[PDB]
Design a protein around this ligand. Structure first.
Ligand SMILES: Cc1cc(Nc2cc(N3CCN(C)CC3)nc(/C=C/c3ccccc3)n2)n[nH]1
Length: 263
């Protein structure tokens, strides 16, 4: 065991759950993702290193592995994609982390890829609020390392479209940097726009854009003054000077106020 709290799986266990690793959700810089189901019926996303022998794997690699598990085992939040387990094995070489499975995939997909169906206003506020609570909690745990890769492709959506912020990448940022990224992700949620943006939105901030220009047209109707308040949160978060940015606890506080949604 490398940690208290998080169970250490036999590879035999995980082979069962993931049908001999036969079902792939995705693939990233540092890991392959396999779909599984535990004998408890709990759906899982298994993140496996891209290293297949002890040779391609350093003691630096190993040290990073155990640090990540340590750090993530300390993070537990309803709006985080929580670590459920891990599996280290030498025969054959296995370095795995087991995460919660989010059936509605990424925020990015639901904002930009699905043409037929769009997230409504209230679902967008709920997602925005959830993200903010997650980041606030992480800043309280002093583990922003888990957020070095934060953007709409790393935020997942549950059955009921709650946000789960993820940290899937094997470990080979300021909280001020995370606050700005939160600003940009909130802006993306509001507008439906993604960096192929600051210049575009500066026109809104300059006073030369109506909210019906800024807000994602797929939304339909929306409360103007709510939208206004959310855009000020964006403006605060993305200030060019990191020192002028709100703390995440202040962001979460203001967001709670505007959305009227508790943690
Ligand atoms: C880590 C994790 C992912 C996850 N859920 C899901 C669900 C999902 N869906 C839902 C149903 N699918 C039929 C379509 C899209 N897609 C993904 C994609 C993951 C990925 C990540 C990086 C690169 C490439 C791909 N993750 N839960 N936990």
């Amino acid at each position: 065991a490398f940690v208290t709290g998080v169970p250490s799986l036999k590879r035999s266990e995980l082979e069962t759950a993931c049908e001999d690793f036969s079902n792939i959700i995705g693939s990233t810089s540092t890991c392959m993702l396999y779909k599984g189901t535990l004998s408890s019926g709990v759906e899982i996303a298994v993140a496996s290193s891209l290293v297949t022998s002890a040779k391609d794997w350093s003691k630096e690699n190993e040290s990073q592995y155990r640090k990540k598990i340590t750090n993530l085992s300390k993070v537990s939040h309803k709006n985080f994609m929580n670590l459920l387990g891990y599996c280290e094995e030498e025969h054959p070489f296995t370095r795995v982390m087991v995460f919660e499975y989010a059936p509605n995939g990424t925020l990015f997909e639901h904002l930009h890829v699905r043409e037929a169906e769009k997230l409504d206003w209230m679902a967008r506020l709920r997602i925005s609020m959830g993200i903010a609570y997650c980041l606030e909690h992480m800043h309280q745990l002093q583990t922003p390392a888990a957020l070095r890769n934060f953007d709409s492709t790393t935020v997942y959506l549950t059955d009921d479209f709650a946000a789960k912020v993820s940290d899937l990448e094997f470990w080979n940022p300021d909280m001020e940097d995370i606050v700005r990224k939160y600003g940009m992700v909130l802006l993306e949620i509001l507008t439906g726009r993604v960096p192929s943006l600051e210049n575009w939105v500066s026109r809104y901030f300059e006073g030369g854009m109506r909210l019906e220009e800024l807000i994602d047209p797929s939304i339909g109707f929306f409360p103007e003054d709510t939208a206004r308040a959310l855009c000020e949160v964006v403006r605060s978060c993305i200030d060019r000077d990191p020192k002028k940015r709100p703390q995440m606890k202040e962001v979460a506080a203001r967001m709670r106020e505007i959305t009227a949604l508790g943690p």
